[PDB]
């Protein structure tokens with residue numbers, strides 16, 4: 001296994017994000033004095049599944065697997081470390097003059113490119129959201145999956161069907177039937193686009209979780225955010241079509257963002 005690496009090659013430092021990611025630590029890969037992120041096992045089959053899945057996925061806009069220590073405990077998964085951290089906090093904390101409308105569009109385009117690649121792989125993300133994306137230099141954005149549903153405080157994730165779901169990002173068939181697919185990822189992408197356009201406001205503001213499904217079923221959808229371009233809102237609306245087969249593919253979504261970005 002070319003992925004196995006020397007646990008000793010890594011100096012472990014502090015928990016990242018002051019603990020909001022669980023057992024993930026800042027590390028230095030001494031061999032290259034490279035700051036990395038290291039997820040450790042504090043659920044063994046689930047952790048090894050994560051590592052195996054990450055070996056088969058590779059894209060400029062997906063978080064980069066660098067290695068694993070799974071030959072003996074405690075197991076590690078090591079990825080690149082993204083300077084600016086998670087997209088949700090980034091948006092909330094940014095200088096909006098720097099991170100302006102053209103930049104927002106560029107972020108969305110990058111996310112759609114990763115999703116297009118995952119769609120080509122028949123890979124189902126299941127938890128697409130700003131909280132699961134990372135920001136690097138020059139507004140580089142990558143999709144990731146921090147396995148947040150058991151750690152996160154608040155009512156982001158709530159009890160549903162025996163697990164915890166981010167109800168407000170979840171497609172109606174995924175809520176009702178536990179049916180997840182590339183098209184439920186498209187639905188969540190539309191919510192992500194609204195997160196981006198509002199610089200990380202919480203979706204369906206003020207609307208209790210217990211009422212969301214019934215509203216959606218009556219064709220209630222979030223309104224266009226202030227200053228979100230019309231074409232971008234049109235794409236949100238398409239992503240939130242009730243019937244999954246009515247939603248666009250990520251190939252179509254990426255092409256549309258590419259065209260809009262070219263024209264800006």
Ligand SMILES: Cc1cn(-c2cc(NC(=O)c3ccc(C)c(Nc4nccc(-c5cccnc5)n4)c3)cc(C(F)(F)F)c2)cn1
Pocket residue numbers: 016017021024037038039049050051053054057062063077078079080081082083084085086125134143144145146
């Ligand atoms: C069974 C299974 C697994 N996955 C899946 C796992 C991941 N993993 C991580 O992103 C992940 C794993 C380990 C580490 C160390 C990291 N890196 C990490 N985790 C938390 C925070 C940070 C961080 C914070 C601030 C600055 N830089 C990095 N990095 C990511 C990523 C994906 C995705 F999105 F790409 F498809 C999918 C899906 N199904």
